[PDB]
Design a protein around this ligand. Structure first.
Ligand SMILES: Nc1ncnc2c1ncn2[C@H]1C[C@H](O)[C@@H](COP(=O)(O)NP(=O)(O)OP(=O)(O)O)O1
Ligand SMILES: Nc1ncnc2c1ncn2[C@H]1C[C@H](O)[C@@H](COP(=O)(O)NP(=O)(O)OP(=O)(O)O)O1
Ligand SMILES: Nc1ncnc2c1ncn2[C@H]1C[C@H](O)[C@@H](COP(=O)(O)NP(=O)(O)OP(=O)(O)O)O1
Ligand SMILES: Nc1ncnc2c1ncn2[C@H]1C[C@H](O)[C@@H](COP(=O)(O)NP(=O)(O)OP(=O)(O)O)O1
Ligand SMILES: [Fe+3]
Ligand SMILES: [Fe+3]
Ligand SMILES: [Fe+3]
Ligand SMILES: [Fe+3]
Ligand SMILES: [Mg+2]
Ligand SMILES: [Mg+2]
Ligand SMILES: [Mg+2]
Ligand SMILES: [Mg+2]
Ligand SMILES: [Mg+2]
Ligand SMILES: [Mg+2]
Ligand SMILES: [Mg+2]
Ligand SMILES: [Mg+2]
Ligand SMILES: [Mg+2]
Ligand SMILES: [Mg+2]
Lengths: 478, 479, 478, 479
């Protein structure tokens, strides 16, 4: 029978026994030990929530959406098999996150292993595999009518991605790939859970209503494929859903101090990578940066690694340790400012590594007790968008009208409002300095404002205050 | 001593005894009987809150903001006198609302009395006066150190605006105090803070604006020889979001197309009863629903009750008004036909509102009509949506300060913040409804309406291809 | 199809079209104009909620409970017919409330019409009838498979009450009478809605979890009747549910000032009863106290009557009007104190009318500038209990164990905790005075404390402060 | 200047720079790594909150209560010095918790070191000292007007209790200040206020106690020649309810039978690793999990991390400890057999706890056993539930005041309030579990257990008729 668990976002929820089996493994339980927001806790003290609780929510919401499509449209032929496959994918979608979640695949692995291209989603697919194989799950699947050759492939495709590119289900069931991770427009139950769950812990209040969206969702034919569509009148609510997502990145997930703590932690991990060993399959030894290649080692790789370093006495870890100690005493690299590009220019990823030199080379009208080298500056480039680079995701939604419920239509931005955004992607540039005394910091402010003046970037907000000698060098800034 | 009242939004709050005296009058207590959202309750059933509770909130928030400026900046010389004046203005700011709140000054009075220019705010100033004079409040004011010649004028100016430096009630060294209750400079005031949180609690839509945060990072600075309320630089994102919230609540709630049509029907019923209902005012004289605004003793008795007065009547002269209210209860409302907007930098002037139904009725549909409809059959509702300052960006009229130079104000432009912010700050929405509700009449109304949009070069209705498949292909600008 | 309404307690909920038909009548819509808590709004300013919204909640919760029993136990043979009958009874259960809700049947009608025995529930049954007959509902019922001779009788029995006493369903469906109004133990969805809804508006927070109770509810055989039973482990939560109910009466619904405002309003209505006329069926004229005998007149009788009196100019209503004006200026009868009986004594309802004389006759050790008559005192006797006079309602619940799910058992108080109440009913006595100057009030405090001393009632809490000369007359009170 | 932090329970709060200095130490930051509810997270998945956030809350509430007494009663002469001392004690009150919080001082240390009498509070006093001394805080204190000889002693006494009038840190005219952080007189303190609201937020169980209300109606009065915090008379009902809430949260959450068994298993694992894990302390010395309490430099590094240290190890000497932790992850827990309570005025003394499993194992079931079970197979968990003062009514140790005589304290007895309040204020619950988990072993455990209850004259288990139908009829007292 069901097992009931009490979650503070979604209340008392029912867990099917196949879900319970998957949950009660070391591979799943690992997610108790990885914080959702990583370094965000060191800015927002309510944000101690881990990936475990998020994963139960996503699995529960995935079931809610699929059941409701089924009740109202029996003609879709949604079976109990289908429902369970969707539920499992929801539950297991984030099994591949590593320590501090997006710090791990966003910053560490790219710095430590420039030869691979990895994502937490690929991790989730591998860790799902290991979990199934190492705990006897396959017979239990069959015991509830699932067919492993086909259904495991279906689960993995829902998590990671792939005429018709899918082996696990055919075109008459394409709507099912739109639940857990929606590649077409990004409207998925993953976002629904983290919006509500992150807001509860952060202390910032949620303004999106997922339950409403589920009441007015429907499957229609669009270009010979069955797809999830929304009532026409929900269009304003979907623009607002993406606005919420951007707001939460601005206030929380990209908080300038949040990001710098993740940077320092990444640093500390880089200086310990050589010296820590994790035992994997067949007794072999892996490092923090290679543990991703062996799921038995990866199983034991969690936020704990922070304290392993912080509590060590090995002299080979002193360097890594001293960085973590600077965090505890709150001696953080200092935030210098933010700026953005201009015209319609972009900054290409190749050039990220050249930026600190450029700042160091700005020749401010000299009144300076220290000259600063490139090693002293960090430049953090952040790409903010509506989840589809510079496209409008609402261009990739279909709607229906009360008068013709089986007929999809499109609704353009013009038809909605002139107060909507004109663009859907931008870049923010933050600069910090590692030298933390008043002299070094004063200087760094001058280099930085000169650099913005030189590249024709926006004028930093406090520019007149931090660099009164420099902001006059542009007419364009009065 | 203080009196403590428990409010569900703000919790346990302390009411100074002068505030208690003002509250316990028939002029104040009237606000128990006027719904904050008017016809909105007939769409959102949690929205039974009245103006009374809102007014206590605004008064409590006004005192919060002023005390906090005081604690942190003793150099401003904010007195207890000042605090109480601010508290009273917060409390009395909406005393002039009439039945169903914005329905009354937004729709009824303009239809019924085109010759006057009236607002609920001017009502509040007059009703404040009546309340003071008819309840002996002036002595009590003095008893707590207020000076009525000056302080009444101060209270009134905070509510309505001004009646070189246009204020008689306080001088330029106290200009920040006019920015609390109703902020004419940029619209960031405690009225909005209370109704965001209060409306969201009752509607079942969740609020994302944090007023308390704003108050922690607020500060008084000199800007163009005037002392003003300014905010930390890092709050700029949150202020754009505050205005976004306001606009969202109009789209979801306050301008819901069925909410507005209920307010329209109620305004109709009031128009057809205006001749026949009599409200006794000062010196025994008789007023009507449309004239009660001219006598505060009559206006005191003018509340949402008037709806039920009409609905429960037997007078044969009220049958017309009554039949409309019956159509509401059985849920036979006018039918929504659709929405459209203008284009380019075209605008629709308020003079022209009354001509629109004729224009819709005169659309020449391409040789396909079995029944005509007249202008009397259509409603056309023009709604101005903006960031509270017509077409201006209100964030251009905010001043900021930086952590390193706390006494020095600055400005921050839109492009220093984000490329994803709105490119405009005002727009108009046009809704069309039909009073004939059968399938035939409604089909036809959809054709006239989509033709009209095609003719005036307005945007394409969302469901246009579904409701008028024969028309929407005829237009280059839409395919 | 369904119609969706957004309620702030229960969210977006679905209304079956037969429910929509019943809702969109003058008989139903009347409930927009009767406050749930009556005079409670004049103490708790958030408490402007009306009976309309409560009634939609009860109808929605009734459907939730019945559907969930059905899903999990197909063998009960719960049909769509049954579900709809339960939903309708939920929706229409409070159609008979009059102005200010419990003020009307608790105070006014007993004073104004001592010859009848009336309750809001009997009103609901009559008003249901009128609503059906006067709006053509009967064909619509049949159109969804309902059978009016039987099903209307079922609905009415669920609301008001009745070997087996029920004509509308047989013993194999007795559990259905336990949803809307539970006569056996009082655990019903009416309470669930008002707990949550009243807490939202009052500003006091709810500590009972109805959704939990629904997950662990089950139908078992008990004395040859099918009944709703709960998991064994919920026993503590049910004691706490009744504790919550008592707490909400103490803090809110019996607030001493709340009750006195209801008293003054009742007064005002008594002095207008002769002079107000409500037109009923066949042009006949009814009064506030007789409108309960004609549903067409009763339809137009709501909280509006307060303002009708307050706004009048008719000289025959001056008396009633002046009472309402005393409310607006906040010149309320003054609260003197509270006391309770002692030993295990009770105060019988016959004697209520003699109490003010008794207080007036107390001979305090005289230092008094006014002597006071009986007409000057009010004595309000309040019976507080767990909804079953002096029984323990948890003695009338059945439970089941995880090991034997179809087998009912009982759990006694002893088996649970020694910190539970020893009694389940008590009476509170409040005294007020209508003379409001300082002299009259000081005196009233002396009469009252002498009276408590005389009848051997508990010592008023502030006794030593309000009557320092009198509390020494008892050794037993040091 | 102030530093503002956003807490989800209390919102945006201001941290004095001395508080910031104390917070940004390894001794304070340690609390990020100890779960408030210990094994409770393994039952309630929202309960991942740690002691760090709680400690910020308690510190903020302590300042709220003391400032409010100050505003309303200037005659108390509460200084800024006093306020800061109270704030610091609130903030540092739980610095001595160890891994999994109450598991550590409730279960592990008593098992592992029966010779000492230790509490997390005494830990907090020592860890406070270490934090001050190892981070240079004493100068900073003086820099804001504190006097360390006196003020450190004051802070410590507020946390732990006393070290005629037993306090060295403040005199009798300031006794009310000891009633804020940890109230020895009646248990009404701000620690409880924070954890009620914080635990409820994370658990998904809703709180019904309103602290802010309590603070509006609090007042300092003379009672038996000592100045004390007193409450309005009308709050008496709410205080009985505050203690009812506390007891409800233990029944639903903190003593959940599976929560407690997880804490038991973890304590087991710690016992089997104690010999083999070494924590470096002051002057390079090595401590164990059970001795780290004797050296604050070692104890600094002792947190919930130790669980994962064991779980992730490969040392063969830790296999025993590791295997228990693996049984947790696969969800093979000890099995709950049932609950019972004593009767009359019988009590179970703490000495005897260790003898109970033998007694259960020795029940002679009526000639019906195919397998025996040993004492090593049973757990018996005795839990003391009370209103925080053993068997006393804490409301007997509260003072009240009346609206008409605000400076004069009084008492209110139980019978002046209600006949529905509890007749007792303490009880014991006994839970029995089995470490053999198969159907045979479990069946048998149920027989031994129900026989044992029948033998000692304890209450009848809830499911007794279902689990042991052959035994429950044999007992007069139960049918
Ligand atoms: N009174 C209460 N109120 C609220 N939540 C509660 C609660 N009691 C537990 N929870 C939460 C804690 C969990 O997250 C969830 C399930 O806890 P159990 O219902 O206690 N189920 P278990 O498996 O112990 O008993 P069995 O196997 O006998 O059915 O409810
Ligand atoms: N237990 C409670 N919990 C929460 N709010 C409560 C409450 N009791 C009342 N309220 C609400 C109702 C009101 O909004 C407010 C104050 O009611 P009182 O504190 O009852 N004050 P009053 O003037 O009756 O007594 P006095 O003059 O002797 O002080 O709190
Ligand atoms: N964006 C929004 N967010 C939250 N609640 C909303 C909302 N819009 C409406 N409500 C609430 C108001 C109501 O309580 C409920 C239904 O409002 P509609 O969904 O607007 N349904 P209607 O009958 O106008 O349109 P149709 O007939 O075309 O389906 O949702
Ligand atoms: N928009 C927002 N809304 C709510 N909480 C927010 C927030 N932004 C931050 N927080 C939370 C995070 C923290 O708990 C707190 C303060 O963060 P900052 O106000 O960002 N202060 P910091 O020290 O970075 O900047 P400076 O030194 O220049 O003043 O509010
Ligand atoms: Fe996710
Ligand atoms: Fe307002
Ligand atoms: Fe009800
Ligand atoms: Fe604590
Ligand atoms: Mg993911
Ligand atoms: Mg995604
Ligand atoms: Mg009072
Ligand atoms: Mg206004
Ligand atoms: Mg305004
Ligand atoms: Mg009822
Ligand atoms: Mg009932
Ligand atoms: Mg900072
Ligand atoms: Mg403690
Ligand atoms: Mg304590």
């Amino acid at each position: 029978t069901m097992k009931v668990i009490n979650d503070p976002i979604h209340g008392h929820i029912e867990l099917h026994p196949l879900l319970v089996r998957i949950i009660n493994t070391p591979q799943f339980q690992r997610l108790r030990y990885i914080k959702q927001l990583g370094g965000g806790y060191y800015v927002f003290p309510g944000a101690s929530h881990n990936r475990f609780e998020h994963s139960l929510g996503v699995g529960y919401l995935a079931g809610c959406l699929v059941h409701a499509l089924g009740e109202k449209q029996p003609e879709l032929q949604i079976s109990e098999r289908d429902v369970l496959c969707v539920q499992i994918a929801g539950l297991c979608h984030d099994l591949g996150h590593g320590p501090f979640s997006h710090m791990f695949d966003g910053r560490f692995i790219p710095l430590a292993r420039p030869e691979v291209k990895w994502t937490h989603e690929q991790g989730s697919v591998m860790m799902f595999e290991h979990l199934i194989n190492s705990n006897g799950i396959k017979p239990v699947m069959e015991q509830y009518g699932l067919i492993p050759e086909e259904d495991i492939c279906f689960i993995k495709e829902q998590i990671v991605g792939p005429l018709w590119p899918y082996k696990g289900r055919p075109e008459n069931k394409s709507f099912l790939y739109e639940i857990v991770s929606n590649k077409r427009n990004g409207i998925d139950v993953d976002k629904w859970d983290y919006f509500a769950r992150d807001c509860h812990h952060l202390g910032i209040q949620n303004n999106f209503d997922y339950k409403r969206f589920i009441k007015f969702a429907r499957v229609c034919e669009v270009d010979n494929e069955l797809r999830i569509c929304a009532r026409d009148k929900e269009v304003g609510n979907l623009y607002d859903m993406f606005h919420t997502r951007n707001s939460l990145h601005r206030r929380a997930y990209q908080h300038k101090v949040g990001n710098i703590i993740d940077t320092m932690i990444t640093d500390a991990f880089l200086k310990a990578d050589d010296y820590i060993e994790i035992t994997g399959a067949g007794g072999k030894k892996y490092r923090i940066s290679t543990a991703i290649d062996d799921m038995e080692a990866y199983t034991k790789l969690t936020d704990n690694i922070f304290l392993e370093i912080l509590y060590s006495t090995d002299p080979k870890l002193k360097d890594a340790r001293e960085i973590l100690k600077q965090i505890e005493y709150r001696n953080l690299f200092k935030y210098v400012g933010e700026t953005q590009p201009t015209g319609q220019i972009k900054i290409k990823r190749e050039d990220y590594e050249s930026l600190p030199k450029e700042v160091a080379s700005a020749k401010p009208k000299v009144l300076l007790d220290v000259k600063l080298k490139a090693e002293d500056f960090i430049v953090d480039v952040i790409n903010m968008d509506y989840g589809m680079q510079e496209k409008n995701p609402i261009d990739h939604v279909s709607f229906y009208c009360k008068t013709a419920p089986n007929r999809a239509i499109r609704i353009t931005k013009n038809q909605v409002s002139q107060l909507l955004p004109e663009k859907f992607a931008e870049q923010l540039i933050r600069v910090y300095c590692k030298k933390v005394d008043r002299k070094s910091l004063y200087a760094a402010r001058q280099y930085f404002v000169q650099w913005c003046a030189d590249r024709n970037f926006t004028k930093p907000q406090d520019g007149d205050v931090i660099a009164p000698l420099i902001t006059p060098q542009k007419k364009e800034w009065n």
